[PDB]
Structure formats: structure tokens, C-alpha cells
Design a protein around this ligand. Sequence first.
Ligand SMILES: Cc1cn([C@H]2C[C@H](O)[C@@H](COP(=O)(O)OP(=O)(O)O)O2)c(=O)[nH]c1=O
Ligand SMILES: Cc1cn([C@H]2C[C@H](O)[C@@H](COP(=O)(O)OP(=O)(O)O)O2)c(=O)[nH]c1=O
Ligand SMILES: [Mg+2]
Lengths: 399, 401
Amino acid sequence: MRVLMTVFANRSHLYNMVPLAWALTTAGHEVHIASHPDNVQAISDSGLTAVPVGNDLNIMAALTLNETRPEKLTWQYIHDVFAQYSQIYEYMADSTMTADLVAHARQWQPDLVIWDALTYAGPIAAEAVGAPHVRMLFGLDQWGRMRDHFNRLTGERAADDRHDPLADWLATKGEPHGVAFTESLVTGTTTLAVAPPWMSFPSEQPALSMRHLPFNGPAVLPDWLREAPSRPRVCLTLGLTLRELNVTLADFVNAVADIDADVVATFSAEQVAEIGDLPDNVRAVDFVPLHALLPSCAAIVHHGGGGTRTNAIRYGVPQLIVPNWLWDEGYVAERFAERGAALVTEVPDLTPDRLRDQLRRLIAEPSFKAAAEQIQKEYDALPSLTETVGELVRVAERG
Amino acid sequence: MRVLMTVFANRSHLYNMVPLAWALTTAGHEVHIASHPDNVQAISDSGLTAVPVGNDLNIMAALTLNETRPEKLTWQYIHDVFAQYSQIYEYMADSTMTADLVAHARQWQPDLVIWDALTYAGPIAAEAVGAPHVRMLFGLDQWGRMRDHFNRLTGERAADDRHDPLADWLATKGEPHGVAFTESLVTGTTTLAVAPPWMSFPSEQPALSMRHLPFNGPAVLPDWLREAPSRPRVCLTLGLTLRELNVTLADFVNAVADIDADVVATFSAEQVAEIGDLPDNVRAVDFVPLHALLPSCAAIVHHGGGGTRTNAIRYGVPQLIVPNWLWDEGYVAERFAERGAALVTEVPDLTPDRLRDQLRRLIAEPSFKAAAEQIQKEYDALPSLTETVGELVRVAERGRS
Ligand SMILES: Cc1cn([C@H]2C[C@H](O)[C@@H](COP(=O)(O)OP(=O)(O)O)O2)c(=O)[nH]c1=O
Ligand SMILES: Cc1cn([C@H]2C[C@H](O)[C@@H](COP(=O)(O)OP(=O)(O)O)O2)c(=O)[nH]c1=O
Ligand SMILES: [Mg+2]
């Protein structure tokens, strides 16, 4: 079958759907990834076939989607979240990008469109040609969670007071293309999840579940990693957070290193500068593929993002999380912590000494490894990518 | 499980194993691709994990393996082909590469080794750690065909008259790693075939067969491929063999283009200058992803190589083959001809008119499309890659205690 994947120009959201693209390819299906011209090279460099659509995006240049406190969740609040975010997402997959992807769908006739959950050109393109389409999540479904509240809150109002920013945007989006608004444009003919169910939001529709393979981009085993380690190894990927936050970067590095273990840290050209002399047990590196490092690690300290955490799931590694709050990092870090596989230090509370002390706990207390390994078992049982391909074949067959 | 795949630094032999690497990766196994450092970039651009071994290879800087005349296939000839190729293959996966691959196999302990059939650091590494190992072909099994002739012939000479260059090579190669010569160092615990069994050599050993997915490398669809085709198309990928033959490169292109279809031809910069004005109906391109082009083509004119012919097979596309002799091109081209799916012109018989006349036939007589279609259908039914991964989990599982 012909599968048209689409993702806005961002490497991380691309990497999200790369293993699936490959599962589809080796099952024999024809796969295109449509993205903005500034993401075509990353698509090519993952081994796949790119279809440029639209203009270069260059995305790297009190209304939150991640609000769960149920008194903040009023209809007006959610309505306004959807007013604000529809403009963000329109921007990320605009009417030129949408019109190119629709024209390619019309000529190529895909049987199935899979769209990254922030790439709203996809369902327009699929409905324009009558193809079913799968909304592919890239962490928790903040948007589906918000929309469930919204739709129900909306149902209980003067028929004349149910203004819907999502319906207006997507009717406008679809209208050059003869695509009429239906809720399926908001959330897919169906949805594909990448987070394990135990950390996920209750949902009104089920999503396909999947044992998510986290693709970490270009990867080379460095020689130093060919070593059996002499003790436990810690991986520190907090470059952005530490550089953003009396106490100096080198203060943090020092306190982190003051443990009975080897530290591998991803750090800047710039940042290796103002750390000055590195502790004898801290290797700084621009990048190390996480799948080749984590099998030898007792702990990972990171920002709580989907790729990194999915790596920690897969290799059973205890986490110290200093959450981002950029999509779902804070909810997900609490979940990890409630299951006893992580310790959490919110950025306002971040101090060199605190990083160090949770880190020593993660090495010394066997309960965190044990919780981590349990989470790994239950990840091991989620549907394989081959199962997921069969589901998507069915999705497509049904029309 | 952990699959340690290994290939010498060569893009084609890598690509040959890219889709199997990925089938395994998305079935959930940990896959390492070990090659010389000059293949690392190619491995990353395929979306795979490179493990560098040995030093850069830089291979693009009487005695053949495609010899099939029975009177030439004496014991002394095969002996000497083995003596010579044992030196060439050592060069291609030398003591440093081998040592590096053995150290990594010791360290990472894979459940299966899958080695490109030309990469003899592979079975050695496997043996050092008792992993089963699967010798992966990249065309016909020329080496096993000769090895079976050689072992039969050797079996009945005088006992003192049974020099085996492969036994002497591989005993030497294995010795620093405590690895003993056994026939399985020559040909693998088992062999994975990439060519459809209808066109394969008979073997005195089993081979897993597979619906070989030909990976065409990095791919960006250009605007021109993405519009509706206005009339039938022909793919011409013969840039190399052409710029080696008073009869001019422009002449070959004029005749070949003199047919009732558009031509998409791959030419270098040097080639396009040397040909000058292109015919109206010819698009010269330095590269075009075959899986995106072929669905719209009535024929493909090419040199008979594995990757290209597997694409023609997959898309059911009639072929005009001008065989090179790098490996198995001559003998496969003859297999397709007999099935009716191709016309052949050897290098020695090649004129502009003969190429054009053959091309006109492929697009005019429906018997070629019919024959290519039938071949496609037999290909669609070979074991899938998912199936091949199961087969390969069985090798790993059976190969344990
Ligand atoms: C910094 C870094 C990231 N990665 C991985 C983590 C992710 O799977 C992927 C993309 O990075 P990023 O977008 O930071 O991941 P996240 O989803 O954690 O925010 O690359 C490495 O493998 N090695 C590295 O050194
Ligand atoms: C030259 C060329 C090759 N390819 C494919 C054919 C092969 O499958 C693959 C590897 O290159 P190559 O080794 O030239 O092909 P072969 O194995 O037929 O000798 O790239 C294209 O898709 N387009 C092109 O223009
Ligand atoms: Mg809670």
C-alpha cells in the first residue's frame, strides 16, 4: 500500500515517526515523508524518501496546553487555549504546505496518511482524497485530553454560545480543498500512541498502543564506549537547562561528579569552555547515541523529554528528571516518580547539591533499578512495530 | 537479541543489507553495523548504528569467479581462484578489522552474526563467541558454486593432493582469536539468498530465500517525478558502460531515444558534456530513486547489477540488459531473457541500432510486460522480511544450548 507520512520541519518529531516509517517500508509498503524543505535532509539522512512540501519553516526562531488543575479547566480557558494554538499549528503547516501536500495526495493516491500530531496539513490531505488517516502522538495527548473536556463543556451550552476555534480553523483550512469540517480532522480516523498506557491520560477514544522505538538520529559507537566499564556509569543530558540556570556551570558539574561512578555528559562547544578543568570522572561529548550508552548506565539525568525517557524505559534505567514543562515532561516525571523509577527536581529547586544527592540515591538504592526494570517488562509487552503495521493495514482497508 | 551485522566499506554491499537491518531493528533487536570507518557516513545515512572497525578501506582507490564453462572448472583452476581471492578478501577485511570485530564480538556478545558474503572478518568474530553466523549474499552464490565443485573434486584426489587455500587462509585468519578452521567459516552456519530461487545456482547446502527489498539509498522526490506522466517512460542507467565505447556517446543516446516514449537517463556531468545537445525526449539526471521512477516506466535499460534488477523485478518492469561482468550479470541476464522478461546485448555486440531496436520491442510487444509481471508475482510470494527475521530468530535459537 501507499503510505503518506507527514511531519512539520522538526528533527525530534521526525525521529518520532522514523521507526514506524521503516516498519512500513520493510513490510513492503511504499512510504513517502512529506515535510518542509528544511527537513528533507534529515528525512534523507534517516534512510527514507522525502517529499518537500511548502516553504522552509525554520521553527528554531498564562495559556498552556499542559494545565491539568481542574479549576483552571473552564470552557473559556480551553476555548482560548484552542484559539491561541490553532494559530501556532496553522503556522507550522500553513496553506502553502497544506496545498502542496493535498496536491501530492491527489496525484499519488495514498491508501493511508499518518500525520505527526502537530502537523494539521495531514488530515486535510487525507480527507481530500478519502483516505483514512492516523494521528500519531509524540508524547501524551494533551490535545485530546483538552478536547474531551472542551467538547463536553461545549455540549452543555446555549446552542448559540458554543463557539469552537478548532472547527472554524479547520473548516477554513479544508475549504479551498472541498474538505468539510468533521471531528475526525481534529483527532484522526484513529490515533497512535507512543507513551506506555500507565503514564497516559484517560481518553474517550482508544488509541492504538505501541512499544515505541525511540530513534536517536545519526549514530556512531565511539571507541571509548567499547570498554567494559570499571564501575557504574551515569549519563547527564542537561546542557540546555544547566546553561539556562553565585553558582556556576562548573559548580553543577562538580557536584554531579562527586559520586562513586563515571559520568558521561553531553555539552556544547561553548559549555566545555566555562566548566574549565573537568573532574577526572566526567567525559564531555557533543552527543552519544543513547541506545549504545544506556546499557552500561545506572542512571540518566535529563529534561524529561519523550525520546530520552523512552530510551530509559527500554533499557531499564533509573532517571533523575529536571522537567522541562514544554509538552508533558512534568506530568510524566511525576508518573515515573510515583512508580518509584525516578527522582524529580523542579528547575526552581535545582541546586548542585540536590542533583548530586538524588543521583547518589539512584545508584545506591536498589528499589529504583527494580522499578525501572518493571517498567521495562511492561514496555516489552506492548504491541511490536510489526503488530502496529497490521493495525495500520486494517485501518487502511476499512476506508 | 543482539545482531552484529558486518560489511566491508562499499555502499552497494551495505545497501544490500540495509532493509534486513531495519526489519530486525523494528522487530525489536539491537543491530550493530560494523564496517571500516569510511562506511560510517553511509551507515548513518541509512538510519543505522555504525560500529567502526579497522582502518579506512578506500577500495575505490584468467582467474574469475563467474567462470561457468565446465572445461575451465578444473580442480587446479578453482584452487588458484581461491588462492587469489583469499588474498583479495583479506585486504578487504584485514587483521586490524578482524581484531576489532572479534573484540566487539567478545565485548557485546551478539546472539547472531550476519556477514556480507565478501566480508570474512565476519565468521571469525562469530566463532570466537559460538554465535551462529549467516552469510548474506548480494547476488548469485558464485563462491559457493565453486566451493561445491572444489569440495567434490578434492574428495577424490590422493589424500596428500588436497591443498585447500581457503582452509590455509581461514586457519591463519582465525588463529590469533583461537578460531579453528571448519567449512562453516567458508560459507556460514547458513546462507541468506537475495536472488529469487528460480534463477539461483543449485547448492549442496540450504539457503534461506527472501523477498529482497533493494534499498536505493538517500531519496528526495523531485518536482518533475511528482506530476502525472504524459506518455510512457523508459529508464536508462548505463552511464558507466557507455562512456567506455567513431561510434559516439551521442550516437548511442540518439538511437536509444528514438522510440515512442520519454527517457530518464542517469548521466554524470562529464557524460552530459560529451553527449552535447540531448534529444527532446531525454531528461539527463545524475541520480533518480528507482522505486519512485519505475511504477511509471515501460522498460529499464541497465548493466544487469543486483540492486537495479531487483528493482525491475519488484516493479514488474521489462529489462534491456547490457551485462557487465563484475559478478553474475551475464548469467542472470540470460535467466531473464529465457523467461521472456528481458532482451540482452553483450558489450561486444553493442551498437546504437541494436539497443534501440531491442528497446522498441520491449515497449511494443506486450509479451515482455506479461513475463516481467509473472516474475513480479513469484517475487511477491517469497518470504517477507518479517518472516525472514523469524527465520533468523530460529537460527539464533537453534544455534543455542
Ligand atoms: C543529546 C542527545 C540526544 N539523544 C537522543 C534522545 C532522543 O531520542 C533524540 C532526540 O533528542 P531530543 O529531541 O532532545 O529528545 P527528547 O525527546 O528527549 O526531548 O536523540 C541521543 O541519543 N544522544 C544525545 O547525546
Ligand atoms: C544509478 C542509480 C542507482 N539506483 C539504485 C540501484 C541500486 O539498487 C542502488 C545501488 O547502486 P548500484 O550499485 O549502481 O546498483 P546495482 O546494485 O544495480 O549495481 O541504487 C537508483 O535508484 N537510481 C539511480 O539513478
Ligand atoms: Mg499524581
